């Protein structure tokens, strides 16, 4: 419909004649400067913002959007023409390829009409690469929404990297030398595989009919850094009644090694088909990557925050269908806000919930998983793995900067117990399938839930007697709540009355405070994460006083209540976490004392 | 050899536009496309019978002749949308027509879908079993030739094949953005398992979905599809091209006859107090004793009421019963009673269905090496019943997946990069003899079988039946056994047995089946009086829990809620009666306290 | 496999439309199309050099690739006409482009038309020999299918094949009105016979004419046609497709060199009065005597000037001379002189040209049984000269056909249902021996041969030469003959004769041939003095008619006028002269009086 030569002119006009008032308003031909860098091998990639083209030709940006593979080659050939102009120094022949390119160019210039076959491919006149950066107008597209209609277009997405292969050299322009003639042969490659050439099409051997057999040479050929990765739907975009959906992404050039599993990245690139037949061909798709970037209210809200029972109301909003466990519901809220990590300190507040079956453990975890921004649910894979050769982060990795709810914690694999032990220690996961201790960042609060062996809990049987989990591993947890279903006819009647209401109403009974919508709760959390409250040194005196007091009670306590410095460290996390709930950047005695109260109650739960 | 004008297609295209031109008339279809424009979809839905009303002839032509008539209709649709809005029409390459309404004889089932309907519209009804992955299918590939500076096209439509070189052998580089691609998925339908004679073989019909119709279906969905049945190029494989798919509710309705409804109403109104026990005695008349079990089994068929909450909590109405007992007790016999009686039940063994097993599975086709997400037995029993025998011999992966479906009624799967989440809400009636026979009444039932201490929690009820060697009890059983054995039909001379068939107070099983089918639709609700009463009993069980079967827990409370709900359904009483809670409480007491 | 866009065709069409968009410029082509629209024709004419001037690249593109570029051009022309007037464009299915102007290498002759020019534009200049009948060629046939109620089309263009059945074998009826037909004629061109070597062979090129180009040509016309030289489907046959035709003037001009003009003017101004007599002596110096005959032969070559009146008359300027004499007289040698001497001459026997004969004839092809109008020897001599030997042996049909050309100068033929009226204006020099030799000066000139006296009336002059046995005269001739025998070239040794090669005062034949050609351009007009003088001479000859060759009549008067006109050409006088008439009068008196 349109003349690509005319488009080639427009880009050449744009690149040569686009500038931006840089820092201190410096009128600078931004791309013009980059071309000069490219001319002297000082750059390799040339990322291009389409909004710059939108600044003077939004229609061109639209045509780039409706088809991107075409315009990439147009720009690349457009830059190919411009670069010889901007050359101003004969820089050193960096790597054999440039001097090889120089050698070929002299040979070609030594030649006058010529058949199209006897000419070098554009892809070999390279060692520069070009990528686009999507316009801010184009809103990011969910991986689900990338349908077949959007193939061939340029799309921006968000997601979580589930896996990424090692860097490897992808061939681009296979080069061959004839057996018995000096003519060199080329073969650009698009498919992931190909048949290598055999017989040279060289004019001399073709005329001579000598059967000059091509022999591949890597030095003549040109490779490119390459990677293969999968990206998963970000948990926020996934509907409740579905699960995350993957998408393959291909990365090459300087975009390689800018991503790890469990990185919440945003990718701009072309969505295109690949074929490794009914009513037409069926072809698997992928997303050729261009740009990768690793991503990170009303006054009544403020009035609500000012309320003293605000945080208590929010705790009541935690699973209002669940009657009871109020102080536990408070504790879960503390985990959701997390710590501060002042400096570093473990901001995540890991909690374990051991208790008899049928006491809302599993339901609570499901609510927490639905509530947290970055959430994972598992039972025990959980940890990373090396599939076949490619990394694949487990649920623990995917919970980074979030929470991993592990139901059925009692039935974990003992190796995995060691794995989470590493996470609670340094918040990283190490693994070696081939004896290669690959360490992965795992910064994620752990919400464990276990059930005692042999039915309900026996109070006479000590801790680590009703349960068969490592006591040292248990003591690592910030809080550890023992939930017992004691037959208490009054309270039993209360819970039953709560249940019958829900059946007779499909609704919780009316409380003092109605629950808030989960999204609003998350908004409060995101506001709470905005703060990093500090600990005044005066509070330390009282804090330490409380610590030695309770530690004395542990010495007084015949059973070792696991009081330690670990106990003190968590108390710091709880206090500053409460300060975040208070939206105050300085911790307070109320926050400290309340944290001690919950700590005491968790110990009281061991009664 | 280039067509100029088609008078018939011209008129047919015009008539459709006239039909879609619903302005002077009631405006329903004009409003539809206006909603279609607002909703951004590109597939109008059409009631075929309205088309019959406006034009019976054209409607007959449409049903008899599908491919041509729809193409004209799509043309009229695209122009009509262009009339209302040109730019919105220009967004989409094409538009689609959705059929609906009554299809007189074209409404068939996969059993009855003979080859006679080829190239005729068909409204099939059935259950989706196999699903294939979404794939994008090229339709119009666009190529550029820098040598000639020339752009070409190549449609495929119904039709080495991929063009890559100019006729001058110049290279052709494709134009991905310009070209047209569409998502495309294949599934397979089968007759509804309840209404499917065992003598006849399976009659499974393929289906092709494209565009928005791709993902509007999963395995184990009761769906009605309307499409054009077409052959394929070569004894020729035959497939149905979907024009519109709709998921009929799995509840459906108890059609039957009003006589059956009236007989049920008269029978229900006769004696509501004894109807539960009268059914229970007549539920499994061949079996002697186990009266609580028969009462329990009736509640399972009746089923509770699922409660879906504002937060998405989905408290299941299904009830789950496990039978443990010594061999040579009427356990397998009892389930075959359920199979004969249950409105919608599927049998299965410990191993489950071949390959797929109990729950769903991914299956390479091996005719094209193609993945297929294939429904398993558990999913197919959704809003129904599954009868598992040798449940102890269930495999370990099934012992894993059973936790999900028991907890959620929902099997998820991500294997082979196949993300899916299938509805599997199904009351389960498992049976498993004790290991090595001869149950020891000292340890847990887990210790005798090995249910990992969790599935017992998942099961609402668990009934033990041991071969107690009481001579009185044996006399009662043996009296029953010989009485049935000695029986001869009323018309017989104590001579010949039944012929070798080449084909496969007391109430009839079919009458029972129809009755419970009607009762399942009833939606009884709580009463404050019963709600208070049950709370006393549950607390009383907690009080009785002091002595030390599994302890009474909150699982037990909701179990009683479903049982009282079930007994309420038995009498068609839309308000749960204290009798319902009363009978459930004593039944649970028998289950935990012999 | 559907072509979408041709950027090259897109740009090329735009370039033509810009060229045709002649409003910013002088309006020459915009006016032409406006005049074309007023003309109501559909074939614009184009000068190539304008295209070269406005776009040299495009013109080179056109000439090197005639076909595609013209198709773009005709596209632009129709679009441009539609811009000026849509409905007039809608009158015609298409428009056509006529090329014109200079072509360096592509302007060739059938002799020089090499196979290399295939697919190139070529401006072939030559002479038409054969013309086929006008026939309507079908190009696009529309059919209607009542069974399907469907219209189908087909285009033939360059491509038994006439479709008559639908794919379903429904009968098809051809919509004769909607189908496209165009008259289509074929002709053949050859090299101009004057400028062609005797050694080489004919190079006949076939031309195709369509639409207005059909009857813009006749046999025996000197034309140049610009067209696309192409092969034919199958070693192959090649034909030229005409794009524009024009009949150049048959007189042309003697370009030669200015040196020849200067030599002619110098020689003419040397002795203008003696140039007539000097040329006559040097006309046939190998033959002694018959000097008056030589004067007449010179008059025949120069000829007169045609006069055409308000009544459509075409009063001929040509002169026709008959020579009769006993065998072994230089009559045959005279004709060889004229053939070597004349500017545009052609020989022929009493039989005439094979098959076609003297004038034209209709010949079936016998390769396809196709009629062809073949020009004869007389027709090709139009505005030239013909030499007929053995004129007595003319066939009776030719004896009749000679009357029309002698009188009107145009031959007509309506036979074989084929209608034509060709031009054959040609001064004719005929000769015939008397029957049985031995001429007798007692009977008529007719009686010695047999001419019916119509031809003798038609011939302007008749000269009788007899084998008189005068010893003095015979000595003069024989001594002249032996002097020619004894004559040897200056460079020779009296030894060997000339080699047997494969190739074939007194002024030169070539220079004389140049001068008479220049003189032929001259158009001498009448002078009142000479007109008065000749009128007295004619009346004197009428007075001489009292004495008892043919009697003097008005034929003789006009014969004298042409003779004086011919002598006026001989001295290059822009008007006739008393010398001219006086020379004619004595010449005529010598002819009729010995
Ligand atoms: N304190 C409680 N308040 C409200 N509902 C409760 C409470 N305890 C248990 N339930 C109810 O118990 C029902 C079934 O037990 P539940 O799912 O809570 O078990 P669980 O504690 O997750 O057990 P397990 O870890 O052994 O699998 C749930 O529907 C939940 O609503
Ligand atoms: N209470 C009973 N009344 C009648 N028949 C019984 C009873 N208990 C067992 N049976 C007999 O047991 C047989 C079926 O046993 P089955 O259920 O297959 O054993 P299991 O289920 O333990 O493998 C039937 O033929 C039936 O007659
Ligand atoms: N006056 C003449 N001068 C020279 N040669 C003559 C003359 N008359 C006749 N001839 C000779 O006659 C021969 C040609 O005769 P030709 O013209 O063929 O006879 P015809 O024309 O009667 O058949 C020539 O060889 C020529 O030399
Ligand atoms: Mg649980
Ligand atoms: Mg059995
Ligand atoms: Mg002769
Ligand atoms: Zn070679």
Contact A507 B309 (CB under 8 A): yes
Question: Which 8-state DSSP code applies to residue B548?
Answer: -
> Coil, strand, or helix at residue B556?
helix
Ligand 1 close to Cβ of residue A497 (< 6 A): no
Mark yes or no for CB contact A152/B311 under 8 Å.
Answer: no
**Packing angle, helices B291-302 and B331-341, rounded to 10:** 30
CA distance A288 to A272: 7
Cβ–Cβ below 8 Å for A280 and B307: no
Please give all residues whose CB falls under 5 A of ion ligand 7, grouped by chain where several chains appear.
A 178, 181, 200, 202, 205, 212
Separation CA A304–CA B126 (nearest Å): 54
C259, with CB counted inside 10 A (0-12, 13-18, 19+), is exposed
Name the experimental technique: cryo-EM
Structure-token pair, residue B249: 């509710």
The DSSP element (H or E) to which A160 belongs, if any, is strand A154-164
Q: Is B401 annotated as a binding residue?
A: no
Question: Is C165:C152 a contact under the CB 8 Å cutoff?
Answer: no
Placement of tokens 């072939």 in the chain: C124
Q: Give the total residue count for chain B.
A: 594
- Inspect the interface and report whether the beta carbons of A3 and C11 lie closer than 8 Å: yes
Question: What end-to-end distance do the CA atoms of chain B give, in Å?
Answer: 89
SS3 B209: strand
What is the interface size between B and C, counted as CB pairs within 8 Å?
54
Report CB contact under 8 Å: B526, A489: no
Whose CA is closest to atom 24 on ligand 3? C330
CA of residue B327 to ligand 2 center, whole Å: 8
Q: Reduced to 3 states, what is the DSSP secondary structure of residue C7?
A: helix
Q: Are A39 and A33 in contact (CB under 8 A)?
A: no
In DSSP notation, C27-91 reads -HHHHHHHHHHHHT--EEE--HHHHHHH-HHHHHHHHHSHHHHHHHHHHHHHHHHHHH-HHHHHH
For residue B234 the two structure tokens come to 């070569």
Between the CA of B394 and the centroid of ligand 4 the distance, in Å, is 22
B377 is in an annotated binding site: yes
Cβ of A508 less than 6 Å from ligand 1: no
DSSP secondary structure of A229-243: EEEE--TTTS-TTS-
Q: Which of B162, B539, B560 to mutate to test the interface with A (most CBs of A within 10 A)?
A: B539
The answer to whether A127 and A225 are in contact (CB under 8 A) is no
Give the chain B residue nearest C156 (alpha carbons): B1
Tokens coding C589: 């008196």
**8 A C-beta contact, residue C16 and residue C74:** no
Give the separation between CA C143 and CA B1, rounded to whole angstroms.
10
Resolution limit, Å: 3.8
- CB distance A256 to A225 below 8 Å: yes
Those residues whose C-beta lies under 8 Å from the C-beta of residue C280, and which sit 6 or more positions away, are C291, C294, C295, C298
Q: Which ligand is nearest to the CA of C439?
A: 3
Distance of alpha carbon A161 from alpha carbon A246, whole angstroms: 9
Longest dimension (CA), chain A: 104
The CATH superfamily of A299-599 is: P-loop containing nucleotide triphosphate hydrolases (3.40.50.300)
Q: How far are the Cα atoms of A60, B455, C133, C137 from residue C364, in angstroms, in the given order? A: 67, 106, 11, 20
Pocket of ligand 2 (CB under 6 A): B 287-289, 327-333, 433, 477, 480-481
Please return the burial class of B18, using the count of CB atoms within 10 Å of its CB with bins 0-12, 13-18 and 19+. middle
Residue among C322, C329, C339, C349 to mutate when testing ligand 3 (max atoms within 8 A of CB): C329
User: Could you tell me which chains touch chain B, where touching means 3 or more CB pairs under 8 A?
Assistant: A, C
Closest of B507, B519, B455 to residue B303, by C-alpha: B519
Q: Which of C309, C326, C346 is nearest to C426 (CA)?
A: C346
Cα B359 from Cα B396, distance rounded (Å): 12
Diameter of chain C measured on Cα atoms: 101
Beta-bridged to residue A215, according to DSSP, are A177
Q: Torsion angle of alpha carbons B439, B442, B447, B452, nearest 10°?
A: 120
Q: How far apart are alpha carbons C214 and C236 in whole angstroms?
A: 25
Mutate to test the interface with B, among C2, C11, C145, C150 (most CBs of B within 10 A): C150
When CB atoms are compared, the residue of B151, B177, B313 closest to A66 is B177
Reduced to 3 states (helix: H, G, I; strand: E, B; else coil), residue B25 is: coil
Q: What residues of B are in contact with residue A74 (Cβ under 8 Å)?
A: none
* CB within 8 Å of A555: residues ≥ 6 apart: none
Tokens of B244: 């519109």
Contacts of B4 in chain C (CB under 8 A): 142, 151-153
Residue A284 touches chain C, beta carbons under 8 Å: no
Q: Give the whole-angstrom CA distance, residue A289 versus residue C556.
A: 104
Task: Characterise C15 by phi-psi region: left (phi > 0), alpha (psi -120 to 50), beta (else).
Answer: alpha
Alpha-carbon distance values, A295 to A159, C350, C527 (Å): 9, 108, 111
Distance CA C117, CA A602 (A): 103
A3 and C5 within 8 Å at the Cβ level: the answer is: no
Q: How far apart are CA B301 and CA B567, in angstroms?
A: 11
Residue whose entry in the numeric block shows the structure tokens 């109301």: A313
Residue B457 in contact with ligand 1 by CB distance below 6 A: yes
Min Cα distance C14 → chain B (Å) is 16
User: Can you name the residues that pair with C227 across neighbouring β-strands?
Assistant: C122, C242
**Contact yes or no for C283/C294 (Cβ under 8 A):** yes
Contact B152 C3 (CB under 8 A): yes
Is B172 strand, coil or helix? coil
Q: If you take atom 24 of ligand 2, which residue's CA is the nearest one?
A: B330
Beta-bridge mates of residue B308: B314
The tokens of A288 are what? Answer: 């050729």
- The separation between CA B222 and the C-alpha centre of its own chain, rounded to angstroms, equals 5
How far apart CA B359 and CA A331 sit, in angstroms, is: 38
**What spacing in Å lies between the alpha carbon of A408 and ligand 4's midpoint?**
7
Three-class DSSP category at C317: coil
Please answer yes or no on whether C5 and A1 come within 8 Å at the CB atom: yes
- What length is written for chain C? 594
**Which chain A residue is nearest to residue C9, measuring alpha carbons?**
A3
- Protein residue with its CA nearest to atom 23 in ligand 3: C327
**Which chain B residue has the Cα nearest residue C142?**
B4
CA-based nearest residue to A486, from B531, B444, B539, B535: B539
* C-beta atoms surrounding A360 within 10 Å: 21
C554 labeled binding residue:
no
- Nearest-Cα distance to chain A for C523, in Å, is 57
Cβ atoms of B191 and B205 within 8 Å: the answer is no
Residue with tokens 């070529």, as numbered in its chain: C122
To the nearest whole Å, the CA of A121 is away from the closest chain C CA by: 23
Specify which residues C139 forms β-bridges with. none
Q: Are strands C135-145 and C180-190 parallel, antiparallel or unpaired?
A: antiparallel
Helix/strand/coil (H, E, C) string of B211-265? HHHCCCCCCCCEEEEEEEEEECCCCCCEEEEEEEEECCCCCCCCCCCHHHHHHHH
Q: Is A283 on the interface with B (CB under 8 A)?
A: yes
- Is residue A451 within 6 Å of ligand 1 at its C-beta? yes
**CA B324, CA B321: separation in Å to the nearest integer?**
10
Helical H segments across A26-94, by residue range: 30-39, 50-54, 58-66, 69-86
Ligand index nearest the alpha carbon of residue C391: 6
Nearest Cα neighbor of B438 from B289, B537, B326, B284 is B326
| Chain B: closest CA distance from residue C10 (Å) | 10
Longest Cα separation, chain B: 101
Indicate the SS3 state at residue A299. helix
Contact A380, A413 (CB under 8 A): yes
Is residue C374 annotated as involved in ligand binding?
yes
Q: How many Cβ atoms sit within 10 Å of the Cβ of residue C223?
A: 21
Please name the residue of chain C whose CA is at the shortest distance from the CA of residue A2.
C7
Pick the residue from chain B with its C-alpha nearest to C140.
B1
Q: Are A579 and A585 in contact (CB under 8 A)?
A: yes
Minimum Cα–Cα distance from B531: chain A residue: A500
Could you tell me how many CB contacts below 8 A there are between chain A and chain B? 161
Distances (CA, A) of B375 to B164, B187, B189, B222, C44: 41, 11, 11, 13, 74
| Helices assigned H by DSSP within A170-309 | 203-208, 299-306
For residues A264 and A232, give the distance between their C-alpha atoms in angstroms, rounded to a whole number: 9
Rounded to an integer, what distance in angstroms lies between the CA atom of residue A318 and that of residue A333? Answer: 8
| Residues with a CB atom less than 6 Å from ligand 3 | C 287-289, 327-333, 433, 477, 480-481
| CA angle (B407 as vertex; B402, B408 as ends), nearest 5 | 100
**Eight-class DSSP state of A508:** P
The DSSP line for C164-181 is: -B-TT--B-EE-TTTSEE
CA dihedral C579, C584, C585, C586 (to 10 degrees): 90
Q: What share of chain C is helix, strand, coil (3-state, %, to 5)?
A: 40, 20, 40
* Distance to chain A for B182, nearest Cα, Å: 5
3-state per-residue secondary structure call for B494-535: CCCCCCCCCCCCCCCHHHHHHHHHHHHHCCCECCHHHHHHHH
Whole-number Å distance between alpha carbons of B312 and C526: 122
Q: Cβ B137–A280 below 8 Å, yes or no?
A: yes
Burial C405-415 (b: 16+ CB within 10 A, else e): bbeebebbbee
Cα separations in angstroms, C345 against C348, C424, C426: 10, 13, 10
Is C24 marked within a binding site?
Answer: no
Which residues, 6 or more positions from C459, have their beta carbon under 8 angstroms from its beta carbon? Answer: C320, C321, C322, C406, C430
A464 token code pair = 């680590």
């Amino acid at each position: 419909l349109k003349d690509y030569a005319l488009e080639k002119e427009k880009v050449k006009k744009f690149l040569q004649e686009f500038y931006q008032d840089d820092e201190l308003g410096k009128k600078q031909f931004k791309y013009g400067n980059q071309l000069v860098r490219l001319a002297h091998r000082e750059q390799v990639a040339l990322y291009v913002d389409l909004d710059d083209v939108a600044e003077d030709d939004p229609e061109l940006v639209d045509s780039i959007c409706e088809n991107a593979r075409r315009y990439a080659k147009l720009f690349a050939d457009a830059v190919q023409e411009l670069l010889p102009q901007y050359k101003e120094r004969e820089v050193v022949n960096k790597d054999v390829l440039d001097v090889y390119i120089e050698h070929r160019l002299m040979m070609e210039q030594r030649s006058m009409v010529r058949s199209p076959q006897n000419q070098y491919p554009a892809e070999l006149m390279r060692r520069f690469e070009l990528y686009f950066q999507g316009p801010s107008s184009n809103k990011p597209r969910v991986i689900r929404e990338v349908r077949a209609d959007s193939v061939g277009k340029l799309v921006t997405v968000r997601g979580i990297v589930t896996r990424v292969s090692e860097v490897k050299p992808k061939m681009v322009v296979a080069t061959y030398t004839c057996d018995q003639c000096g003519a060199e042969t080329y073969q650009p490659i698009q498919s992931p595989t190909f048949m290598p050439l055999i017989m040279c099409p060289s004019q001399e051997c073709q005329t001579n009919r000598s059967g000059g057999r091509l022999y591949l040479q890597t030095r003549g050929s040109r490779f490119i850094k390459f990677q293969e990765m999968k990206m998963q739907e970000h948990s926020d975009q996934v509907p409740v009644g579905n699960i995350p959906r993957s998408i393959t992404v291909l990365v090459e050039g300087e975009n390689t090694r800018i991503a790890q599993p469990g990185d919440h990245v945003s990718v701009t690139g072309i969505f295109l088909p690949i074929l490794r037949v009914v009513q037409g061909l069926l072809s698997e798709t992928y997303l050729e990557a261009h740009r990768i970037v690793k991503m990170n209210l009303t006054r009544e809200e403020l009035r609500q925050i000012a309320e003293e029972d605000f945080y208590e109301k929010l705790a009541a909003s935690i699973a209002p269908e669940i009657y009871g466990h109020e102080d536990v519901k408070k504790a879960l809220l503390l985990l959701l806000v997390g710590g501060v990590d002042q400096s570093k300190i473990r901001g995540n507040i890991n909690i374990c919930l051991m208790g008899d079956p049928g006491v809302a453990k599993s339901q609570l975890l499901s609510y927490i998983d639905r509530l947290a921004p970055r959430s994972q649910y598992t039972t025990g894979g959980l940890t990373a793995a090396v599939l076949r050769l490619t990394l694949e982060g487990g649920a623990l990795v995917l919970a980074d900067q979030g929470v991993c709810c592990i139901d059925e914690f009692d039935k974990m694999a003992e190796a995995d117990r060691t794995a989470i032990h590493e996470v609670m220690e340094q918040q990283t996961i190490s693994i070696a399938k081939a004896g290669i201790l690959t360490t992965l960042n795992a910064r994620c609060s752990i919400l464990a839930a276990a059930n005692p062996a042999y039915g309900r809990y026996n109070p006479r049987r000590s801790l680590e007697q009703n349960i068969q989990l490592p006591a040292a591993l248990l003591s690592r947890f910030d809080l550890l709540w023992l939930i017992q279903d004691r037959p208490d006819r009054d309270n039993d009647l209360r819970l039953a009355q709560h249940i019958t209401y829900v059946h007779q109403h499909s609704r919780q009974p009316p409380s003092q405070f109605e629950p808030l919508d989960m999204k609003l709760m998350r908004r409060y959390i995101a506001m709470c994460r905005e703060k990093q409250p500090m600990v005044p040194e005066s509070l330390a005196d009282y804090i330490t006083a409380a610590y030695v007091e309770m530690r004395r009670e542990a010495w007084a306590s015949k059973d070792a209540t696991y009081t330690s410095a670990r106990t003190l460290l968590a108390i710091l996390r709880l206090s500053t976490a409460l300060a975040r709930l208070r939206m105050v950047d300085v911790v307070e005695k109320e926050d400290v004392n309340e944290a001690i109260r919950l700590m005491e109650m968790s110990k009281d739960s061991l009664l | 050899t280039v067509v100029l004008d088609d008078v018939e297609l011209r008129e047919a295209q015009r008539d459709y536009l006239d039909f879609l031109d619903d302005e002077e008339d009631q405006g329903i279809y004009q409003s539809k496309v206006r909603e279609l424009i607002s909703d951004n979809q590109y597939r109008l839905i059409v009631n075929v019978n309205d088309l019959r009303r406006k034009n019976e002839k054209r409607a007959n032509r449409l049903l008899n002749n599908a491919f041509e008539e729809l193409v004209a209709f799509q043309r009229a649709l695209k122009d009509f949308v262009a009339s209302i809005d040109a730019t919105y029409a220009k967004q989409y390459e094409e538009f689609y027509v959705g059929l609906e309404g009554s299809f007189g004889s074209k409404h068939v089932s996969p059993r009855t879908l003979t080859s006679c309907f080829l190239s005729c519209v068909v409204c099939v009804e059935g259950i989706v079993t196999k699903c294939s992955l979404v794939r994008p299918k090229v339709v119009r590939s666009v190529h550029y030739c820098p040598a000639t500076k020339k752009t070409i096209e190549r449609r495929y439509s119904d039709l080495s094949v991929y063009p890559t070189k100019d006729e001058e052998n110049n290279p052709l580089e494709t134009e991905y953005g310009l070209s047209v691609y569409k998502d495309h998925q294949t599934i397979t339908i089968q007759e509804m398992p309840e209404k499917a004679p065992a003598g006849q073989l399976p009659r499974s019909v393929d289906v092709i979905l494209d565009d928005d119709l791709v993902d509007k279906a999963k395995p184990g969905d009761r769906v009605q599809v309307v499409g054009t049945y077409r052959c394929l190029p070569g004894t020729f494989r035959t497939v149905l091209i979907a024009c519109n798919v709709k998921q009929m509710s799995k509840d459906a309705q108890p059609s039957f006859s009003a006589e059956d409804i009236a007989k049920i109403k008269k029978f229900s109104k006769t004696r509501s107090k004894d109807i539960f026990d009268q059914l229970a005695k007549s539920l499994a008349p061949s079996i002697h004793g186990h009266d609580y079990v028969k009462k329990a089994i009736l509640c399972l068929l009746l089923g509770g009421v699922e409660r879906d909450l504002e937060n998405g909590s989905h408290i299941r109405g299904d009830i789950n019963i496990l039978l443990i007992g010594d061999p040579s007790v009427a356990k397998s016999q009892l389930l075959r009673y359920v199979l004969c009686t249950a409105p919608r039940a599927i049998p299965t063994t410990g191993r489950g269905s071949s390959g797929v097993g109990l729950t769903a599975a991914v299956t390479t086709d091996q005719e094209t090496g193609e993945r297929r997400l294939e429904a398993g037995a558990m999913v197919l029993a959704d809003r129904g019943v599954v009868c598992i025998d040798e449940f102890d011999k269930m495999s370990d992966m099934d012992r894993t997946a059973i936790h999900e479906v028991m907890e959620q009624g929902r099997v998820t799967i991500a294997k082979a990069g196949i993300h899916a989440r299938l509805n599997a809400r199904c009351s389960v009636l498992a049976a498993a003899n004790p290991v090595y026979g001869r149950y020891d009444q000292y340890k847990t039932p887990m210790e005798n079988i090995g249910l990992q201490d969790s599935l017992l929690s998942r099961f609402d009820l668990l009934f033990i039946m041991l071969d107690q060697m009481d001579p009185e009890q044996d006399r009662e059983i043996s009296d029953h056994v010989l009485r049935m054995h000695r029986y001869r039909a009323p018309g017989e001379q104590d001579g010949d047995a039944m012929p070798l068939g080449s084909a496969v107070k007391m109430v009839s099983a079919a009458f029972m089946k129809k009755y419970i089918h009607v009762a399942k639709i009833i939606k009884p609700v709580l009463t404050q009086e019963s709600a208070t009463y049950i709370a006393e009993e549950y607390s009383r069980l907690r009080s009785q829990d002091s002595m030390s079967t599994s302890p009474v827990t909150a699982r037990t409370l909701e179990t009683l809620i479903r049982l009282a709900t079930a007994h309420a359904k038995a009498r068609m009483s839309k308000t749960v009666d204290l009798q319902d809670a009363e009978e459930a409480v004593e039944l649970v007491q028998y289950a935990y306290f012999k």
